[PDB]
Amino acid sequence: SDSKIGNGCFGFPLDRIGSVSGLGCNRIMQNPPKKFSGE
Numbered sequence: 562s563d564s565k566i567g568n569g570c571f572g573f574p575l576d577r578i579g580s581v582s583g584l585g586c587n588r589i590m591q592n593p594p595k596k597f598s599g600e
Contacts, residue, residue: 570597 566572575585578598586597593599 562568563571569588570584570586573585573587575581578585578587583600584597587593588597
């Protein structure tokens, strides 16, 4: 759900941390819940 310029796996920088493969998503700025994003 968009509210403040992207929220989850949408407006975030999905073209570096993974770029589709590693999934740019990152629930909560304080790192993801040991899922979605990583490495």
